[PDB]
């Protein structure tokens, strides 16, 4: 029911940056710069512009001081200047609100288009950006937990197939998904850049931003972030992990910033650039689908997510999911999951894996 | 309570091997050889003799077929032939039942003394052992999850201070422990070889064997064990982890063998060989003491452990712990844990960390 | 001076496989399967088809028994079936010899075009391929040295600018190169898939195949290959490395198969998918350009490379490079390199 | 030739610290703290006291400003205060010069004995030391190249068998050595703490200090040290490696400090604490003995080493080795090495491996 426009989709390269509204800029800076080691491209009393170790565009993360913590924009780089025009025509044909600024919404971005998309998310499309020193060989700066790239976003939306169809028309290709035997979709992952995803849809009340993910080189870099958070006595901000994902096969960690924005650290997924890249569908009851080692998924992972803003900076109203809840069908009192399909040994009924119930 | 003998203690080098009784030898072989990659020194219809990658003594693990799965012996190597005589005299003075076999209890061990120690555990002391090819540079054999050394044992016993004093008199030095502000010791770690430990006491009903631990070279090796267990669809046999320990600072994983004997994989603890090595005491309510990252300790970790045998091969009767339960005081109904001492934020009252409760 | 065809270029996805002729198939199998741990997709008495851990197409490497060890085909996957037609029209316009087999040249590949390209290299273009089990989560099979993807080829050719322009016309984008102040190009790296390269041109006598490269997940996997080669007492087959590259920033190792085909093991280069990806030019005298740690490049790495075959299976005649030699200008008797530009300390002259 | 004293040997725990005389304290600080990330226990205008990540004794390295760069002391910790007395009586009986100071020679060490040992090296034995914060869990400080422990020293000495017998009587156990088929010993490694070594003897003109070695947790930490040195454009201070050793099986790297004092970064050797630990002897012509991957050993690694000082602070005179030279027999003009014993293929005649 989101129609395919007659207008051609913009050619999207990759996820490029997020703008997050934060309430205390100094506390946020401590987290992203001092704890996580991201590199400052620009900062003032109002905003902090941050990039990963291997980035050459101006930034991967913009922290903007504001009254209500929320996602303000998730930005995708398009292939040419003309693709911004294509994005504008595309979303206008969808009847979405758009705003076009020839000199950008944030520093280091040129001609850019922001839109309130059909799922209620603030997307940005841009080509022009200020190139900065690519720090990829600055091993004099390299931290034991170095974040090397922006990898993806993850969005919470009530109707996954509706959103997926819309993203496929935009050019994103589905790589993996989670479904049940009676036709409910719980989550889908989709890419432009040849990794498992650039964005992903997680079934839930929405629009909300589930997380932004950065990559490391190696698994030990993710271990170090955990170790460093323990040393800083902020282990309570480690939400979930570390682990190996089923979907994507990446090694992962989820942590929470000072405003509870969720950040994933992620490494070593696989190549998806071929157009007949085999899709993988997982059963929602498979306890190795999210954590391959069977570790239980914390309920906050399923329930909590950041607000998103519309183009005036007001919070988007949330619409409730009516399809089945992943939490409820897997780890709730009526849930279940299995280690081996069909085997009662290693299956969990009315609780999570490993001997825990919901707190 | 356990008196210091007048007889000199044996000079103990290190933990050397454990003999575990298993119910199905083939299934147990599949676990230790095919899944974990231990190296077969000898086997027959009744026993499998296994060693780690860097070992030169005959074995680190003996699997013995029997009717009831149990620990049959935890074995420590002593410095000289004469230390076996010292051991016999020492335990005889302690009023303990002992058995001496000039040609060993298991193949590849010579003159050996087994004892029913004052905590009810079957200890063996030996010097003589058949040397085998040390595989430390056999990289043609090296597995992605290679177990390189035997590291320690961990024993469940109801009265930790009683056992701790006895082990200190035997020459083990306590490196770390867990206590509360009311005089209760929950656990202690003690060594001879200059690592955090060779054995350890965990407060609980006993005597029972909590685990046997093997080490890997690096953290990624432990990750690979998890990943392989996922691939073999036996993730339900991963009990707890992987993680970073608070006590010991080691990276760790706990898995369960076919008879539910617990095995820990462990790496990168610190040097303790100096006689005034600083002893570290953690508070039992510190939520970073067991898992540095704050991840909850599954209840089975506190409640489940292996039976131990007496010298006749009969199961030792279990004596109930009357001191406070670590489980109860941290994750139980009236339990409490903190992330930062004296901060309510990041504390847990009557449940586990990260959003979980006891199943 | 290779003219751009008016015919549209095929849309190339990536490097996909190489077909190497080997003289002793069993010896070759020992190296690629037992030492290196590649996964068998098919074998018989004449060929072995091998793939890396994360591959879903039929193979990344075909070993074919033949009388003379050589590269028989370096194969690139194209985006659609129609791109094979585009490739045929493109190379035909270039005046190249071509051969189309609607049922493929090797097993597991369908409609395929092979060509003797303008640099004398046997290129293949195909879309159709038999999908196989993607082993990316088969950690029960995973080796301590596991090879997880095919990453790139490297080609020895006498005139780098000439080849570079030809590959740019084909849609490859240069990511890094090596030049001097006099204006000589010694090497160039170029990509389609968004890594530092899918192929690369090394200045030298050619056409010859310098190496085929596979990636690992982590640096320790490369270390393990070395360690295993020591344990197998074949450390003499370790040619160069392990190291960190300057160009590409990748951790690397070069080893030699039983017919002296050079295999690179490679990991952790960077993303190049943006069309304005900044191009990095290194000076040929910078001693950190090839090995970032300043370790010397053994002369064999510059002088040795594999023969390539024409479409009849005969060895391609070789053309001598007339441009300056990177070996000669860096480690030859009149060569030099520096650690810090302009500093005699940490410089090497004739050495 | 060096007699075994009647007096009991001291019970030596491990190598504990080295005192290095350096010429420019600021440059040495930049290397050891800024490049390598060692932790400052104490510093003033004359000395920098440094320790590794997991250490609790006051320091593993003392950098002392002086006119001539050299080893001033290689220190071993002993098990009890009474073992310093035992050390003293032992070295007096050996006829060695000794000097004992109840309040130590450097800050952070108490009662200490220093000796000019029978091979001409300045050994210190102590028990008493000031405990400091053990940083083993301070992951807020942890560097990508973090040095976690002091592992060993390596000493250059002309007659290895002579030295080996002496260290053995002192309680060190030989774990590995290098010999040839003609009765010559080229190197030996020996331990107290249950690793491959606490010190080692390399055949060569001496006494000289070959290197001091620090451990990392993992192989990637050593790789990061190389990468950082490249980024700082000081790759010319990487001498050798990184590699896998044959002897010891450890992953390694050799780098040079501003006074050319050689530092090794080392990780993942094996447990040697059993008294019948099997000794491993390598042939000197085995090209996998030093670098398991057969990478060539640069001649500077065999020829260059640091001066050592006597108890008065003067440089020890160097005695020339007359036994065969490892450099000459493996990579010199008449040198030879093999990959596979008895196989001509993969052997090197009169030159180093790998072209
Ligand atoms: O398996 N899932 O839990 C996944 C897989 C990949 C992701 O990036 C993620 O956020 C969740
Ligand atoms: O730095 N060069 O020596 C390089 C860089 C990347 C490569 O894949 C290579 O084969 C050589
Ligand atoms: O094998 N050798 O070259 C070795 C082995 C261990 C060492 O610590 C060393 O400095 C050299
Ligand atoms: Ca209390
Ligand atoms: Cl624990
Ligand atoms: Co994600
Ligand atoms: Co343990
Ligand atoms: Co290459
Ligand atoms: Co050394």
Tell whether residue B181 is among the known ligand binding residues.
yes
HEC per residue, D18-81:
EEEEECCHHHHHHHHHHHCCCEEEEECCCEEEEECCCCCCCCCEEEEECCCCEEEEEEEEECCH
What is the Cα C226 distance to its own chain's centre?
Answer: 20
Ligand 3 proximity of D261 Cβ (cutoff 6 Å):
no
Nearest one of D273, D259, D284, D286 to D343, comparing CA atoms? D286
Q: Which residues pair with A255 in a beta bridge?
A: A238, A263
Task: Using the atom order of ligand 1, give the atom closest to the CA of residue A297.
Answer: 3
- Experimental method reported for this structure: X-ray
Chain B residues touching D249 at Cβ < 8 A: 136-137
**Is B236:B260 a contact under the CB 8 Å cutoff?**
no
Query: Dihedral of CA D295/D298/D299/D301: which sign?
Result: negative
Tell whether residue B99 is among the known ligand binding residues.
no
Q: Of C138, C143, C220, which is closest to B218 when you measure between CB atoms?
A: C220
Binding site, annotated residues of C for Mn(2+): 152, 211, 264
Query: Dihedral of CA A224/A229/A231/A235: which sign?
Result: negative
Residues of chain C with CATH 4.10.1270.10: 288-351
Residues of chain A with CATH 4.10.1270.10: 288-359
CA distance A13 to C276: 12
How is residue D248 written in tokens?
A: 């010891």
Nearest one of D324, D322, D327, D348 to D336, comparing CA atoms? D348
For chain A, how many residues are written? 359
Task: Using the atom order of ligand 3, give the atom closest to the CA of residue D211.
Answer: 10
Ligand 3 proximity of D264 Cβ (cutoff 6 Å):
yes
DSSP-based three-state secondary structure for B16: strand
* CATH of span A149-287: 3.10.180.10
Tell me the CATH architecture of domain D288-355. Irregular (4.10)
Going by alpha carbons, the residue nearest to atom 2 of ligand 1 is A290
Nearest one of B321, B276, B266, B327 to B302, comparing CA atoms? B327
CA distance B173 to B177: 11
Distance between D324 CA and the closest CA of chain B, angstroms: 28
Going by alpha carbons, the residue nearest to atom 2 of ligand 3 is D290
How is residue D136 written in tokens?
A: 């083993």
How is residue B240 written in tokens?
A: 């707890």
Task: Using the atom order of ligand 3, give the atom closest to the CA of residue D213.
Answer: 8
In order of A87, B17, C80, C145, D216, the CA distances from B145 in angstroms are 49, 20, 41, 12, 20
Chain B residues touching D131 at Cβ < 8 A: 276, 278
| Chain D residue closest in CA terms to C298 | D355
Task: Using the atom order of ligand 1, give the atom closest to the CA of residue A211.
Answer: 10
Q: Of C139, C141, C231, which is closest to B137 when you measure between CB atoms?
A: C231
Instruction: Output the CA D156–ligand 9 centroid distance in Å.
Output: 12
- Following DSSP, what letter does each residue of C82-115 receive, concatenated? HHHHHHHHHHHHTT--EEEETT-SSTTB-SEEEE
DSSP-based three-state secondary structure for B94: coil
**Is B290:B245 a contact under the CB 8 Å cutoff?**
yes
- Following DSSP, what letter does each residue of A332-345 receive, concatenated? STT-EEBSSTT-ST
Q: Of A137, A144, A231, which is closest to D144 when you measure between CB atoms?
A: A144
The ligand placed nearest to the CA atom of residue D153 is 9
Give, as one character, the DSSP assignment of residue B165: H
Nearest one of D114, D101, D124, D97 to D17, comparing CA atoms? D124
Nearest one of D295, D299, D290 to D332, comparing CA atoms? D299
Q: Which of A247, A251, A280, A337 to mutate to test the pocket of ligand 1 (most atoms within 8 A of CB)?
A: A247
Chain D residues touching C219 at Cβ < 8 A: 219-220, 223
Instruction: Output the CA B142–ligand 9 centroid distance in Å.
Output: 24
Tell whether residue D182 is among the known ligand binding residues.
yes
DSSP-based three-state secondary structure for B253: strand
Asked if D224 and A138 come within 8 Å (Cβ–Cβ), the reply is no
| Chain B residue closest in CA terms to C232 | B140
Task: Using the atom order of ligand 2, give the atom closest to the CA of residue C297.
Answer: 3
CA distance A124 to A72: 10
Angle, helices B219-231 vs A219-231, to 10°: value is: 120
Q: Name every residue whose Cβ is closer than 8 Å to that of residue A323 and which is 6 or more positions away in sequence.
A: A158, A159, A160, A184, A185, A186, A203
Asked if C339 and D242 come within 8 Å (Cβ–Cβ), the reply is no
HEC per residue, B33-86:
HHHCCCEEEEECCCEEEEECCCCCCCCCEEEEECCCCEEEEEEEEECCHHHHHH
Query: Dihedral of CA D294/D300/D304/D305: which sign?
Result: negative
CA distance C220 to C142: 14
**Is A24:A63 a contact under the CB 8 Å cutoff?**
no
CA distance C164 to C179: 13
Burial C79-96 (b: 16+ CB within 10 A, else e): beeebbbbbbbbbeebee
Going by alpha carbons, the residue nearest to atom 6 of ligand 1 is A248
How is residue C89 written in tokens?
A: 């029209």
**Is A259:A23 a contact under the CB 8 Å cutoff?**
yes
Nearest one of A211, A213, A265, A263 to A242, comparing CA atoms? A265
Asked if D235 and C298 come within 8 Å (Cβ–Cβ), the reply is no
Beta-carbon count within 10 A of D328 CB: 12
Task: Provide φ and ψ at D237, rounded to 5°.
Answer: -90, 0
How is residue A217 written in tokens?
A: 């080189």
For chain C, how many residues are written? 351
CA distance C220 to C244: 13
Task: Provide φ and ψ at A260, rounded to 5°.
Answer: 65, 15
CA distance D19 to D225: 23
Give, as one character, the DSSP assignment of residue B235: G
How is residue A244 written in tokens?
A: 């190996």
* CATH of span A288-359: 4.10.1270.10
Residues of chain C with CATH 3.10.180.10: 10-148, 149-287
* CATH of span C288-351: 4.10.1270.10
- Give CA torsion, residues C290, C294, C295, C301, to 10 deg: 20
Ligand 1 binding pocket, CB closer than 6 Å = A 154, 213, 245-248, 250, 264, 266, 289-290
Q: Which of C151, C214, C247 to mutate to test the pocket of ligand 2 (most atoms within 8 A of CB)?
A: C247
Give, as one character, the DSSP assignment of residue A30: I
Asked if C138 and B227 come within 8 Å (Cβ–Cβ), the reply is no
Tell whether residue B211 is among the known ligand binding residues.
yes
Alpha-helix residue ranges (DSSP H) falling in chain B = 25-29, 81-93, 160-169, 219-231, 299-303, 326-330
Give, as one character, the DSSP assignment of residue D10: P
CA distance A255 to C152: 36
Place domain B10-148 in its CATH homologous superfamily: 2,3-Dihydroxybiphenyl 1,2-Dioxygenase, domain 1 (3.10.180.10)
Q: Of B223, B229, B235, which is closest to A219 when you measure between CB atoms?
A: B223
**Is D240:D301 a contact under the CB 8 Å cutoff?**
yes
Instruction: Output the CA D177–ligand 9 centroid distance in Å.
Output: 13
- Looking up tokens 């024993």 gives B155
DSSP-based three-state secondary structure for B30: helix
Beta-carbon count within 10 A of B45 CB: 7
């Amino acid at each position: 029911e989101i129609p395919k426009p007659v207008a051609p989709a913009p050619d999207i390269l990759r996820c490029a940056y997020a703008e997050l509204v934060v309430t205390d800029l100094a506390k946020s800076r401590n987290f992203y710069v001092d704890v996580l080691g991201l590199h400052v491209s620009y900062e003032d009393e109002n905003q902090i512009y941050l990039r990963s170790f291997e980035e050459f565009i101006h930034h991967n993360l913009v922290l903007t001081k504001g009254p209500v913590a929320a996602l303000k924009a998730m930005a995708f780089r398009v292939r040419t200047p003309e693709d911004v025009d294509k994005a504008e025509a595309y979303y206008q044909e969808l009847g979405c609100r758009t705003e076009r600024r020839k000199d950008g919404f944030v520093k280091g971005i040129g001609d850019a288009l922001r839109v309130e998309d059909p799922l209620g998310f603030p997307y940005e499309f841009f080509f022009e950006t200020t190139h900065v020193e690519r720090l990829h060989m600055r091993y004099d700066l390299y931290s034991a937990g170095e974040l090397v790239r922006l990898d993806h976003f993850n969005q919470v939306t009530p109707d996954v197939p509706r959103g997926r169809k819309y993203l496929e028309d935009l050019g994103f290709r589905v790589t993996e998904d989670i479904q049940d035997d009676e036709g409910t979709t719980y989550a889908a992952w989709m890419h432009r850049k040849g990794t498992v995803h650039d964005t992903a849809l997680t079934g839930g009340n929405g629009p909300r931003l589930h997380h932004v993910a950065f990559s490391t080189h190696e698994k030990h870099n993710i271990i170090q972030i955990c170790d460093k958070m323990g040393a800083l006595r902020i282990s309570d901000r480690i939400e979930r992990g570390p682990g190996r994902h089923g979907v994507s096969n990446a090694f992962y960690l989820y942590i929470l910033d000072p405003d509870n924005h969720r950040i994933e650290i992620y490494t070593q997924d696989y190549y998806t650039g071929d157009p007949d890249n085999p899709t993988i569908t997982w059963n929602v009851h498979d306890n190795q689908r999210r954590d391959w080692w069977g570790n239980p998924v914390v309920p906050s992972w399923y329930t909590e997510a950041s607000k998103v803003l519309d183009l005036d900076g007001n919070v988007q109203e949330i619409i409730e999911r009516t399809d089945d809840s992943e939490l409820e069908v897997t780890i709730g009192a009526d849930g279940f999951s299995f280690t081996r399909a069909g085997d009662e040994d290693g299956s969990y009924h009315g609780q999570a894996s490993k001997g825990f119930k919901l707190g």
